[PDB]
Design a protein around this ligand. Structure first.
Ligand SMILES: [K+]
Ligand SMILES: [K+]
Ligand SMILES: [K+]
Ligand SMILES: [K+]
Ligand SMILES: [K+]
Ligand SMILES: [K+]
Ligand SMILES: [K+]
Ligand SMILES: [K+]
Ligand SMILES: [K+]
Ligand SMILES: [K+]
Ligand SMILES: [K+]
Ligand SMILES: [K+]
Ligand SMILES: [K+]
Ligand SMILES: [K+]
Ligand SMILES: [Mg+2]
Ligand SMILES: [Mg+2]
Ligand SMILES: [Mg+2]
Ligand SMILES: [Mg+2]
Ligand SMILES: [Mg+2]
Ligand SMILES: [Mg+2]
Ligand SMILES: [Mg+2]
Ligand SMILES: [Mg+2]
Ligand SMILES: [Mg+2]
Ligand SMILES: [Mg+2]
Ligand SMILES: [Mg+2]
Ligand SMILES: [Mg+2]
Ligand SMILES: [Mg+2]
Ligand SMILES: [Mg+2]
Ligand SMILES: [Mg+2]
Ligand SMILES: [Mg+2]
Ligand SMILES: [Mg+2]
Ligand SMILES: [Mg+2]
Ligand SMILES: [Mg+2]
Ligand SMILES: [Mg+2]
Ligand SMILES: [Mg+2]
Ligand SMILES: [Mg+2]
Ligand SMILES: [Mg+2]
Ligand SMILES: [Mg+2]
Ligand SMILES: [Mg+2]
Ligand SMILES: [Mg+2]
Ligand SMILES: [Mg+2]
Ligand SMILES: [Mg+2]
Ligand SMILES: [Mg+2]
Lengths: 154, 79, 205, 129, 121
RNA sequence: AAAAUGGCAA
RNA sequence: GCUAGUAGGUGGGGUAACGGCUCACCUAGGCGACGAUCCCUAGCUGGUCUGAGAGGAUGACCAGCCACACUGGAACUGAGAC
RNA sequence: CAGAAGAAGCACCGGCUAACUCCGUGCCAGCAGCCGCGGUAAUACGGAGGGUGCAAGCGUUAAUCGGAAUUACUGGGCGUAAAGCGCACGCAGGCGGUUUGUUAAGUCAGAUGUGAAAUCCCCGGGCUCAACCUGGGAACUGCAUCUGAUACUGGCAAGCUUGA
RNA sequence: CCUGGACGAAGACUGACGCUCAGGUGCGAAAGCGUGGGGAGCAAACAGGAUUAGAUACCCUGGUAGUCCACGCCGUAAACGAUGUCGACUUGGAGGUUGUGCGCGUGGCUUCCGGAGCUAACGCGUUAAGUCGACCGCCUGGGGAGUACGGCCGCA
RNA sequence: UGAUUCAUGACUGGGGUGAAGUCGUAACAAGGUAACCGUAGGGGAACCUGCGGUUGGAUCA
C-alpha cells in the first residue's frame, strides 16, 4: 500500500490557562490498482497525528473501477464546498490535477487523467470530493448488467 | 426561381410605396436561443394595392428611390 | 550554451550516476556520490512535489547535456507527436547524433561524443554532420571520418562500450568504426529509473 | 403553468427512482411514448403501457438492479426556453458512450448512436445514464 | 441569470484600472526632482525612507522611492522612474531606476548589482 | 438609586 | 426623441450608370427602446497573442480593402485623379 | 596551418518557490509581488562561503490573456455571507395541454457556388540540424442556392377536454 | 345599506380562451405636508422637578403639534418568511380551522415536528431552502455611498 | 446667442488618513433605558424622544 501525507495543520482550542495547540494530518493510502482510502488523524504531536490518519486510511479503503490506469468516463465529485471534475486521458498524459487530488489519484493507480477543482480547494473536502467522484464511476460491465445488455451492445 | 421575401405591411402612407417588416429567426451567437429579428424594407407598390397588416411577397430590384430597392410581387394575405 | 562546470556535483545532486565520467573507475571512488554538493549537502531536506518533478527533469537534461530552451522544445515536439508524450520525449533525446555516437561507443562520454561531432569527426550517411542536436532517422549510418579513425580516444571509447550493455536498436562494427541506427529505441530499451511522467506533468504545471 | 411535459416525464422518473417507486404514471402523449420506447429498448425502464382513450395515461415500470435505480441520472437538454439541435457530427456522447442521448430526428426519436449510424442530426431531448 | 435576461443585457467585464497611471503604459518615464526628502513609513514599520517628488515629461507630478543604501539625488536631478509601489509608503507608486541618467548606482553593492545600477567589480 | 474610563504591542 | 431634400410621388435636368443626384410641383411622410439622434473612442479584414475549449485581448511585420498627401477648398487633363 | 589557445554572465536561496550558513547591522540602515522581515545569536537587511535556476544572456518595468467557475454561453449566485421590486394588474416580449391533417419557416441530410494567398494543423520535400523555405492535403466551424427528410419547434385548418 | 374575493357538492356549458411580465398603471403602515373641521385620553416639542461629575436623557408633574374626521399630497418601513410568480413531482406524525359523502372517508386553508434529499453551517423538509420546467427582478470585496452631480417626481 | 468639456477660484460641505489631543460613553452582556427600521421633532457630540414596525432581544426561578 502506498501512503501519502496530504496535509498537516496546527489547530487550537482556548482554555482558561490559554491556548492548547494540536496537529491534524490528512493522509491517503492506495494499492495502485483501484483501492484507495483517506484518513484524518488528530494528536498533540505531529507523528502521532500521522499514525492515527494512516491507521484510519487503511480501514477506510474503497474500490474504484479503473481502466488501464485511466478513468472509465468523465466524473463529477462534490463534498461541502469542493467540486471536482475528472476525465479520462491518453497514456503519457500524466496526472494533470491539483495537489490534493493528485495524491488520491496517484495512490489509487490512476496514471493518466485531466482534472479541475472548483469552489473550495480545502484539502479535507477536496479529498472527499475526489474519492466520491471515483466511487460513483461506472465500468462498461456494470452498466451492461444494470441495463440487462451485453458490453458489446453497450 | 427568383429570390423573394415575405413580410407584413406596417405602413402604406407613402404614395406608391409601402414599409414591409421581414421577420427572421436567428440563433443568438453566444446564448444559442433562437431569437426573432426584424428587417424593415421600403417597397414600391405601383397600384397602392397593399394595406397595413397585409402579408406580401417582395423582390429585390434596381434603386427606385433613396430608400427603395425592392418591389411588390403579390399580396399573399389581406389584413 | 553548454555546462562546463564540475560533472560529479550534478550526479551528487541527482543522487544517481549520470555517466558524466568514462566509467573506467567507480563514481564512489571519484566522489561522495551519496552526499549532495556543498556545505549543507550532508543534510537531506524533504522534497516537495514540485521539487520531485524539477529534479527528474534536471536529471534527464543532465544525462543528455541539453539546456532548458532546447529541452522545452523537445517536450513541445513530443506532445505534438502522436502517441505517448513522455515516451516520445525520450525517443527524441535518444535520436540526437551526440547520444547516438556515445551509444555506438565512438565516444567515452556524451561530452566526448559532442566534441567528436562538433569537431567534424562524424559522418551521417557519408556526409559530415557537426550538429550535436541532429536527429538520426532509422536506417541511417553513423561513421567516424577516415582522418579521425586513427584517434586514440575513439579506440578507448569502443573498449568501454564493450563493458557497457549494448543497445539493441543500434548495430555497430568496430575497426570499421561505423554504426547503423536500426530503429528508434522502445521505452523498454531505455532505463526504467527515469520517470518521464514527472517531466510531462512539470511542463503542464 | 405546465410548459414542458417532457421535463415533467423525466422528473417523474427521476423522483420515482429516488422514492423507489415500482412504477410512475402520467398523462400520455405521442412524444412521451416515443421516448419511453427508447428507454425500454435501452433497458433503462422495464416496460411501459398506455391506458384510456379520452385522457390516456402512460405508466412506466421502473427497474432497480441491486436495490439501486438503473437510471442514475436523467436530464432535459433541449427545453422550451432554449432549444438544442445538433448536426450528426456534433451529436453528444453521454458518460463516454455508456449513457444515451435521446434525439428527435426526421426519422423519429432514437439514441445518439442510432442517429449517428443513420447519419442524422436532430433535437437533443435528454441525456440518460 | 436567464438567457433571455443576458440577451437583453450581456455580462459586463470590470474596468481594471492601472496602478501606475503616470507611466501611461510606458516601461519608464523621465522626470525632474522637484523635492528630495525622507518620509516615515506606516505602522508597523519604522524608518526614514528616501523619496523624491518628480515632475514627469508627461506633466504628471508623482512621488518615487529611491531604493538602495545612499543616493546623490537633489532638486533638479533628472531621473528615470519605473513602476513599483512601496507598500509602507502611501502615495508612492513608483521607483527611481538606479544607475540611469543623473541617478547614480549604489556604492559597494556586490549582490543584485543590476537592480542597483552597479557595474561588475 | 447611582455605577464613567483603561494607547498599541506580541 | 430625430428629420423639410426630410420620406414618397410626377415631370424636367444630370450621370458611364440606377437614384432626392438636382430642381419645380404634389403628398406628408421617414427614422427610433431590435437604441434612432447626440457624445466619446477607432482605419477594417485575413490574421496575431492567450485560452482545454467557449471566450478574452489585439490588428506591428506580411497580404486584401479603405482613407489621406502642409491646412481648407476647387476644378482641369485623362480610360482612369478631383 | 598553429595553439587550450581567443570566448560566462545574470537573478535567486523565510513561505508561496528549486536552493543555508557565518559575519556586520540592531524597528536603524534597509528589504518587500503577497504574507511580512529589521528593536543584539536575522536561512528575509548588507557582505562572504556554499547552493538553486537560467545562460549569451539574465533580471526589472510596462502591456495582454491565463490562473479568475471573480460577469459563470459552455460555467455562479440571491433565508442568515453581496443579491427577491412593499404588493399587484397588465401592454410589448418570452414561454405554453392534447389529436389529426397540411405546410416545410426553424431543424436535419446531401449537392453546388463561394469562403484570396499567406498563416494554423497533417503528411512530405529543401538548407550539415534547427529556426527558416517549400509541395500536396486538411481546415476556413460561415453565407447563398438547389434537392430531399418530417420527429421536434413554428405557421395554417379542424378538433378534443385534462389547464383556464 | 352597497360591494370584492375564497371554498365545497353534483351536474351542465365554453374549448387552451393559459403562465410570466421590461416599460406603464393602481394600491401601499407610521410619521409628515395642504385646506377645512374636531380634540376626551395619549403625547414629539416645550416648561418645571429629580437623578448625576454633567444629564440638552432615562424617572416625576405638566403639556403643544400630532394621534381623530373629510378631501388632496407624500410613496417610504427589519413594507420580513430578511425566502418573486405559476405549474408538476417526491416517505411520515400530531394538531387547528372551514366544507362535504357514507365510525369510516373526501376537499380548502393553517400550526408544530420530522424522513430522504438539500445546505458552509444554522437549518429547510409536500405551505421545500428537495427534484424539475416557464417568465421576471436582482448580486459581483470592505469603506467612500445609496452619497455627489445630472434627470424625473414632490408644496415641502 | 446657446450647449458641452477641461482648467482654475476667495470661501465653504462632507469624506479619508495621521500621536498615547479634548469632551463624553452611543453599540456589543438584559451593554446597565433590549437593539434596530421608516419618519418627525429636539440636542456640544456620540445621540434623546414621539408614532408605527421587526426579532436580527436577555430573563422566567
Ligand atoms: K516592523
Ligand atoms: K438628398
Ligand atoms: K424623382
Ligand atoms: K477578431
Ligand atoms: K485632407
Ligand atoms: K491616357
Ligand atoms: K449560467
Ligand atoms: K410540423
Ligand atoms: K405581456
Ligand atoms: K393637545
Ligand atoms: K417579477
Ligand atoms: K467651475
Ligand atoms: K441606547
Ligand atoms: K426613532
Ligand atoms: Mg541560444
Ligand atoms: Mg485616429
Ligand atoms: Mg479557462
Ligand atoms: Mg474628362
Ligand atoms: Mg524550498
Ligand atoms: Mg547577527
Ligand atoms: Mg503582467
Ligand atoms: Mg473567465
Ligand atoms: Mg458566488
Ligand atoms: Mg447583515
Ligand atoms: Mg444580505
Ligand atoms: Mg416579497
Ligand atoms: Mg427548411
Ligand atoms: Mg486561405
Ligand atoms: Mg404542428
Ligand atoms: Mg397618519
Ligand atoms: Mg393634518
Ligand atoms: Mg401626559
Ligand atoms: Mg412625560
Ligand atoms: Mg426600500
Ligand atoms: Mg408588517
Ligand atoms: Mg427586502
Ligand atoms: Mg402577476
Ligand atoms: Mg422541520
Ligand atoms: Mg439620495
Ligand atoms: Mg452604553
Ligand atoms: Mg442601551
Ligand atoms: Mg441589544
Ligand atoms: Mg428627548
Amino acid at each position: 500500500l502506498q501512503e501519502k501525507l496530504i496535509a498537516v495543520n496546527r489547530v487550537s482550542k482556548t482554555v482558561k490557562g490559554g491556548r492548547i495547540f494540536s496537529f491534524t494530518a490528512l493522509t491517503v493510502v492506495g494499492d495502485g490498482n483501484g483501492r484507495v482510502g483517506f484518513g484524518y488523524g488528530k494528536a498533540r504531536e505531529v507523528p502521532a497525528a500521522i499514525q492515527k490518519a494512516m491507521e484510519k486510511a487503511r480501514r477506510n479503503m474503497i474500490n474504484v473501477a479503473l481502466n488501464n490506469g485511466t478513468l472509465q468516463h468523465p466524473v463529477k465529485g462534490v463534498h461541502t464546498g469542493s467540486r471536482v471534475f475528472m476525465q479520462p486521458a491518453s497514456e503519457g498524459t500524466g496526472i494533470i490535477a491539483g495537489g490534493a487530488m493528485r495524491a488520491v489519484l496517484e495512490v489509487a493507480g490512476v496514471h493518466n487523467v485531466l482534472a479541475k477543482a472548483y469552489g473550495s480547494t480545502n484539502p479535507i473536502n477536496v479529498v472527499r470530493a475526489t474519492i466520491d467522484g471515483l466511487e460513483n464511476m461506472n465500468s462498461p460491465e456494470m452498466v451492461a448488467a444494470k441495463r440487462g445488455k451485453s458490453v458489446e451492445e453497450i | 426561381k427568383i429570390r423573394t421575401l415575405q413580410g407584413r405591411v406596417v405602413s402604406d402612407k407613402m404614395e406608391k410605396s409601402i414599409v414591409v417588416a421581414i421577420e427572421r429567426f436567428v440563433k443568438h451567437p453566444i446564448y444559442g436561443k433562437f431569437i426573432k429579428r426584424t428587417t424593415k424594407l421600403h417597397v414600391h407598390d405601383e397600384n397602392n394595392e397593399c394595406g397595413i397588416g397585409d402579408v406580401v411577397e417582395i423582390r429585390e430590384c434596381r434603386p427606385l428611390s433613396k430608400t427603395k430597392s425592392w418591389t411588390l410581387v403579390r399580396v399573399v394575405e389581406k389584413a | 550554451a553548454r555546462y562546463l562546470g564540475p560533472k560529479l556535483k550534478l550526479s551528487r545532486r541527482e543522487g544517481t550516476d549520470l555517466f558524466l565520467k568514462s566509467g573506467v573507475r567507480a563514481i564512489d571512488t571519484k566522489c561522495k556520490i551519496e552526499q549532495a554538493p556543498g556545505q549543507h549537502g550532508a543534510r537531506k531536506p524533504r522534497l516537495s512535489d514540485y521539487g520531485v518533478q524539477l529534479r527528474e527533469k534536471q536529471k534527464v537534461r543532465r544525462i543528455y547535456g541539453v539546456l532548458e530552451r532546447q529541452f522545452r522544445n523537445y517536450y513541445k515536439e513530443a506532445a505534438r507527436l502522436k502517441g505517448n508524450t513522455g515516451e516520445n520525449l525520450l525517443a527524441l533525446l535518444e535520436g540526437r547524433l551526440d547520444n547516438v555516437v556515445y551509444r555506438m561507443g565512438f565516444g567515452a562520454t556524451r561530452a566526448e561524443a559532442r566534441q567528436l561531432v562538433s569537431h567534424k569527426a562524424i559522418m551521417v550517411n557519408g556526409r559530415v554532420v557537426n550538429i550535436a542536436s541532429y536527429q538520426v532517422s532509422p536506417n541511417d549510418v553513423v561513421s567516424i571520418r577516415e582522418k579521425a579513425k586513427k584517434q586514440s580516444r575513439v579506440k578507448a571509447a569502443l573498449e568501454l562500450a564493450e563493458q557497457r550493455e549494448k543497445p539493441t536498436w543500434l548495430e555497430v562494427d568496430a575497426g570499421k568504426m561505423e554504426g547503423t541506427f536500426k530503429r528508434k529505441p522502445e521505452r523498454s530499451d531505455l532505463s526504467a529509473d527515469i520517470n518521464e511522467h514527472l517531466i510531462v506533468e512539470l511542463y503542464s504545471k | 403553468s405546465m410548459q414542458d411535459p417532457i421535463a415533467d416525464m423525466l422528473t417523474r422518473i427521476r423522483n420515482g427512482q429516488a422514492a423507489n417507486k415500482a412504477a410512475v404514471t402520467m398523462p400520455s402523449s405521442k412524444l412521451k411514448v416515443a421516448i419511453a420506447n427508447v428507454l425500454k429498448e435501452e433497458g433503462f425502464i422495464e416496460d411501459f403501457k398506455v391506458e384510456g382513450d379520452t385522457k390516456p395515461e402512460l405508466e412506466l415500470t421502473l427497474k432497480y438492479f441491486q436495490g439501486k435505480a438503473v437510471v442514475e441520472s436523467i436530464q432535459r437538454v433541449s427545453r422550451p426556453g432554449l432549444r438544442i439541435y445538433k448536426r450528426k457530427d456534433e451529436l453528444p456522447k453521454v458518460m463516454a458512450g455508456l449513457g444515451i442521448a435521446v434525439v428527435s430526428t426526421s426519422k423519429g426519436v432514437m439514441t445518439d448512436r442510432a442517429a449517428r449510424q443513420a447519419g442524422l442530426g436532430g433535437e437533443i431531448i435528454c441525456y440518460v445514464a | 441569470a436567464t438567457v433571455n435576461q443576458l440577451v437583453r443585457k450581456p455580462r459586463a467585464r470590470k474596468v481594471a484600472k492601472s496602478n501606475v497611471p503616470a507611466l501611461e503604459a510606458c516601461p519608464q518615464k523621465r522626470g525632474v526632482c522637484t523635492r528630495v526628502y525622507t518620509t516615515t513609513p506606516k505602522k508597523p514599520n519604522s524608518a526614514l525612507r528616501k523619496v523624491c517628488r518628480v515632475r514627469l515629461t508627461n506633466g504628471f507630478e508623482v512621488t518615487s522611492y529611491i531604493g538602495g543604501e545612499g543616493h546623490n539625488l537633489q532638486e533638479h536631478s533628472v531621473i528615470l522612474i519605473r513602476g513599483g509601489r512601496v507598500k509602507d509608503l502611501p502615495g508612492v507608486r513608483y521607483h527611481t531606476v538606479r544607475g540611469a541618467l543623473d541617478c547614480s548606482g549604489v556604492k559597494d553593492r556586490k549582490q543584485a548589482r543590476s537592480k542597483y545600477g552597479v557595474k561588475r567589480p
